[PDB]
Every structure is written in C-alpha cells, then in structure tokens.
Amino acid sequence: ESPLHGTQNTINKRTQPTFGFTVNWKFSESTTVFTGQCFIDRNGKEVLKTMWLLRSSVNDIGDDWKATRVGIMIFTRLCSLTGKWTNDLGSNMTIGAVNSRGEFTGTYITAVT
Amino acid sequence: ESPLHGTQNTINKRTQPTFGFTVNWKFSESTTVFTGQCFIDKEVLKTMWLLRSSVNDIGDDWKATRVGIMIFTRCSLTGKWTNDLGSNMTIGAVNSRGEFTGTYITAVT
Amino acid sequence: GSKESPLHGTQNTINKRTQPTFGFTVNWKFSESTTVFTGQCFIDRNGKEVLKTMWLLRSSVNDIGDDWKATRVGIMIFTRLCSLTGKWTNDLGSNMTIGAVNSRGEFTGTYITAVT
Amino acid sequence: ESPLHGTQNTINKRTQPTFGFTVNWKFSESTTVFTGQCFIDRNGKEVLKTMWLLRSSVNDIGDDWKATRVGIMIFTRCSLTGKWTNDLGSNMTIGAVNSRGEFTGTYITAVT
Ligand SMILES: O=C(O)CCCC[C@@H]1SC[C@@H]2NC(=O)N[C@@H]21
Ligand SMILES: O=C(O)CCCC[C@@H]1SC[C@@H]2NC(=O)N[C@@H]21
Ligand SMILES: O=C(O)CCCC[C@@H]1SC[C@@H]2NC(=O)N[C@@H]21
Ligand SMILES: O=C(O)CCCC[C@@H]1SC[C@@H]2NC(=O)N[C@@H]21
Numbered sequence: 001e002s003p004l005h006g007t008q009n010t011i012n013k014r015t016q017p018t019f020g021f022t023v024n025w026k027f028s029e030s031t032t033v034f035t036g037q038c039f040i041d042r043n044g045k046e047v048l049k050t051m052w053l054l055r056s057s058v059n060d061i062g063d064d065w066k067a068t069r070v071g072i073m074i075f076t077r078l079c080s081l082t083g084k085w086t087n088d089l090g091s092n093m094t095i096g097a098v099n100s101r102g103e104f105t106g107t108y109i110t111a112v113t
Numbered sequence: 114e115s116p117l118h119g120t121q122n123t124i125n126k127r128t129q130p131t132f133g134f135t136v137n138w139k140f141s142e143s144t145t146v147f148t149g150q151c152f153i154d155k156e157v158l159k160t161m162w163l164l165r166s167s168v169n170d171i172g173d174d175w176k177a178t179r180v181g182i183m184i185f186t187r188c189s190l191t192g193k194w195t196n197d198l199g200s201n202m203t204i205g206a207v208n209s210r211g212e213f214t215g216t217y218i219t220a221v222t
Numbered sequence: 223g224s225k226e227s228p229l230h231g232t233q234n235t236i237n238k239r240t241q242p243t244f245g246f247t248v249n250w251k252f253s254e255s256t257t258v259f260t261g262q263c264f265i266d267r268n269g270k271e272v273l274k275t276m277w278l279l280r281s282s283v284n285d286i287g288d289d290w291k292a293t294r295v296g297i298m299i300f301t302r303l304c305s306l307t308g309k310w311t312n313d314l315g316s317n318m319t320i321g322a323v324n325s326r327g328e329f330t331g332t333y334i335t336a337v338t
Numbered sequence: 339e340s341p342l343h344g345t346q347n348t349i350n351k352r353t354q355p356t357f358g359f360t361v362n363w364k365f366s367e368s369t370t371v372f373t374g375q376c377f378i379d380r381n382g383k384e385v386l387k388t389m390w391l392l393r394s395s396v397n398d399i400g401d402d403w404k405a406t407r408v409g410i411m412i413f414t415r416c417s418l419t420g421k422w423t424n425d426l427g428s429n430m431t432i433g434a435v436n437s438r439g440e441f442t443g444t445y446i447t448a449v450t
Contacts, residue, residue, distance in 0.1 A: 003120070003210070005118055005119065005120050005212060006118065006135045006146075007116070007118055007135050007137040007144070008137075008141050008144075009137055009138065009141075009143070009144050009167070010137070011138070011139070011140075011141065011142045012142055015142065015167050015169065017142070017144075017167070018142060018143055018144040018166070018167050019135075019144055020135030020136075020137075020144040020145065020146035020163075020165065021135060021146075022118075022119050022120045022132075022133030022135060022146070022148070022181060023133075024120035024121075024122060024123075024133070024210075025122065025124070025155040025214075026124065026213055027124075028124060029122050029124050029125060029130075029131060030122065030131060031120065031121075031122050031132055031133040032133065032148070033133040033134075033135065033146035033147065033148040033163065034146065035135070035144055035145070035146040035163045035164075035165040035178070036165060036166065037167060037168065037174065037177065039174070040171075041171055042171070044410060047171070049171070049174045050201050051163055051165075051178050051295065051296070052163075053133075053146070053150055053162075053163060053405075053408075054148075055131045055132075055133065055146045055150065055160055055161070056131070057122070057127065057129075057130075057131050057150065058150065059129075059164045061152045061154070061157075061159070062449070064150070064152075064159045065409050065426060065449065066392075066407060066409075066449075067149075068148070068149075068161045068407060068408055068409060069149065069404060069407055069408070070180070070276065070295060070391075070406055070407070070408040071276070071297070071403050071404075071406060072296070072297045087137040089403065095211040101116070102137060103118060111142060112400070112401075112403065112404075115255050115267055159239065161408065161409070163295075164291075172337075175314065176279075176294055176296075176337075177297070178294060178295055178296065179291055179293060179294050180278075180294070180295040180389065180408060181290050181291070181293060181389070181410070182409070182410050198290060221287070221288075221290060221291075228345070228438075229345065230343060230345055230360075230377040230440065231360050232341070232343065232360045232362040233362075233369075234362050234363060234366075234367055234368065234369050234371070235367055235395075236367050237365075237367065237399075240395050240396070240397055241395075242367065242369065242395070242397050243367060243369040243393045244360075244369055244392070245360035245361075245362075245369040245370065245371035245391075245393065246371075247344040247345050247357075247358035247359060247360065247371070247373070247431060248358075249347055249436045250347065250349070251349065251441055252349075253349065254347055254349050254350055254352065254356060255347065256345070256346075256347050256356040256357055256358040256373050257358065257373070257374040258344075258358040258359075258360070258372065258391070259371070259385075260360075260369050260371040260372035260392075260393040260406070261393060261405075262393065262395060262396065262402070262405065264402065265399075266399070272399075274399070274402045276391055276393075276406045277391075278358075278371065278373045278389055278390075278391055278408075279359075279373075280356045280358065280373040280374060280375065280389075281356070282347075282350075282352065282354075282355075282356050282375065283375065284354075284378060286377045286380065286385075286387070289375070289377070289387045290382070291343060292375065292387075293373070293389045295408070312361040326341070327342070327362055334409060
C-alpha cells in the first residue's frame, strides 16, 4: 500500500465533481497523479474515469524528456469518492472521507509494476 | 488563488525527488494534476500536467483531458515558484511523510 | 456521422516475435484539427486482435499564447468489425479502414469519428 | 537518421497550420508520433510547438499500460518544409508539402 492524497472540486454541486490525487509510491522513487470524474453510467453503476501520469526518477536533467508515462484507469466499486475501488488490471484503492474543503486521503495497491 | 495538495517522494536519498500535486481550481470546475521532479545545479521543477474538464455526460469523457508541460523556477518544493506563462505558486513545509499544501495562481485560462 | 478523413502512418518491427508498433495521423476534413494515434496490436484473451492506442488531438489556436491548451490526450481500443490492414471499430462508434501495408511499413486509410 | 511522414491540415488555408507525423525509428521497434502547430512567434521566428507520444514495443498485452511516454518538442529553424532543430540536439528536415497536406522527411534523434 502507498498513501494517496487529493481533492475534489467544490465549485458547483450540479455535476459530479472532477478530482485529482497523487499516489506517493513507497516502494520506488516514482510519483503518479490521477485526474478524472465520477459518473453514473447508463446501467446505474458508479464509474471513475481517470487518466494518469507516472513520473519516474532520473539522475540527469538531460533525461527529463523520457520520465513521464501516460495512460488511463477506469475504476468500479469493489458518486461519493469515499469507499473501495477496483480495476481490471487488479489494482485497487480505498478513499476516506471527503471533508468540507473537498480533501481526501486514501491508500492505493498496484497489481502491476 | 487556488489550493494545491501533493506529496513528494521520500524514498532513498534523494537530492532530486519526484513529486505530484493536485490544484483544486477556485474559479472553474476543472482540476489539474502536476507531476515531475525537482532538479538542483539553481533549482528547477520540470513537470507535466493533466487538466481535467468537467463533462455533463459520460459520452463526452473522451475529450475531457488536456496535457502539457510546465517548468517552474525560484532541492525542496517549499517556497515560491514562478513560470513564463506568468503563473505563480507558493508551497509550504513538506512533512516527514512528504505531504505538502500550497496555493497556485494561474496567469492563463 | 462525420465526413470520412484520410489517415497516414507507418509500422516498425525488428523481432517477429512481438507485433509491430505503429503510428498514424488523421487529417480531419471537417475541422482545423489533427490527431495522431500510436500503439500496438495484441491477441486478446478471446480470440481477438486488438489495437491498443493512445492519441493526441491538436486543436488550432490563433494566438501562440494559447498554445498550452491546444492538446487533448486519451486512449482508443479498436477491434476488427495481427495485420493492420482491414476494418476496425471502437466503443464510441468510430470506424477506421486501413489499406495494404508496404515494404517500408507505410500505410494509408480512412477514419470516420462518431464523436466531436 | 529515421524516416517520418505525416500531413498538415489546410482546411482553412491557415498561415499557422496544425500537423502530425509518425517517426519510424530504424534501430529500435519504437514509434513516436508528433502533433502541433506552426507559429509565427512574437519576434518573427517560425516555431513548431508540438507534443509527442513515444510507443515502446511490449511483449505481453499485460504490459500495454506502461508502453507510452509523453512530452513536448519545440522546433526552430510558417512552412513545415526545411531544417529544424530543438534543445535536445535533435534535427529534422521536412520535404515538400503536396496539395493534400502530405509530406515526408528525416529525423536525426540526439537522445534515446
Ligand atoms: O512502478 C512504480 O515505480 C510505481 C508503480 C506505478 C504503477 C502504475 S501507476 C498507473 C498504472 N495503474 C496502476 O494501478 N498501476 C500502474
Ligand atoms: O481553466 C481552468 O479550468 C483552470 C485553469 C487551468 C490553468 C492551467 S493548468 C496548466 C497550465 N499551467 C498554468 O500555470 N496554468 C495552466
Ligand atoms: O473534433 C475534431 O476537430 C476532430 C475529431 C477528433 C475526434 C477524436 S480523435 C480521438 C478520439 N477518437 C475518436 O474516434 N474520436 C475522438
Ligand atoms: O527511444 C527510442 O526507441 C527511439 C528514440 C526516441 C526519441 C525521442 S522521440 C521524442 C524526443 N524528441 C527527440 O528529438 N528525441 C526524443
């Protein structure tokens, strides 16, 4: 498990907020950021559609150009962000309560490396 | 100003940590996340970002995310940073676990 | 439901054991935009050939000051409606036809997007 | 030195057109795609502002998630045709652009 920390937007309540979080990897020098929005899909299921940037560490500023990978992640419950979320890769995460400023913490387990 | 919340990687040394943060925009319903690395030789943050727009329908999700880069100049994340879009950021003390908060001002929309 | 647009690309391989990577550009005929797609063909759990791609959609901006916001990113998985040649479809409803691939790896085709 | 080709969009006859190209790397199995726009900058210089996706060949559909890198590339010496260079030390030359927006060129990468 690595800790995650982020926020969900609080501007309107007329939609399901966008959100972003950072996973602060505890087994490597990398960081990953996720950003997305929660939807009620056509079948009634909550879905988090996110995209992510995975930042690797480099030792030389001249290698900076190759340090960022990008991709998607769709999470389904195991539209409050709070709870447990799973993915098809087998990765999963837990999000705690969202407070009045829209902040939340959680934990992330990656099935893949 | 909009609040940012992130974490700096604390694994091993490292003189030049990676990091990530999320800016929760206070004038828009979107969210941006930045990730990158703090270099020192003079400190510079080289980041890439994803700007997530809010969409009304799950049908529109495909077009909701823009991407780009941002270099900030005046390795610790703590303190004041600027860039050449004219955007400014202030970052507070970093925790032993690596968590930080701050504020972000964007010069462009 | 859109106008068909041309696409042009190349595939790249050395070791026959892995399927080639490829990229292509779609030259949109109803907009000022350009999209590039890159990815690789796999055989699904299923059966099935799948093109797993990611894309960058470049909008036209008038002012270089607005360059920062001109690029969208996402994924697209295509399945036949592991050769690139033939007809491919996706979850949005978008459709793609790719012609024969030449000895240089070059290929062309047509793209119809069901979304804008 | 590696081959590229792509197309420029001329749907509005823009003096600052968008474009994209594929670079077919010759001594690897990777593919990079670039997309951007040609600008006349504030100081009169031509500048290509682009972003790229670099795709690695992976062995297994299960590693597909880690196969794509992203970043920017700004080229300076608005026509695409000619010689262009960047901060990394890389060099590109673009051929003639035909009536349909199509061009080919070569890309000498300085980094890997
Ligand atoms: O390898 C590292 O240094 C950290 C692990 C990165 C795991 C990535 S982050 C995006 C993708 N989605 C996942 O659930 N795991 C991978
Ligand atoms: O327009 C919005 O919805 C929020 C403002 C977005 C600001 C972006 S985030 C990436 C880029 N870097 C900046 O300093 N500002 C812009
Ligand atoms: O809107 C435009 O200017 C051109 C249409 C682009 C459609 C995009 S490209 C990425 C994604 N995949 C699709 O099949 N449609 C969208
Ligand atoms: O690594 C490979 O397998 C092929 C070389 C990749 C070169 C990349 S593409 C983006 C960036 N810009 C450059 O001029 N070189 C690198």
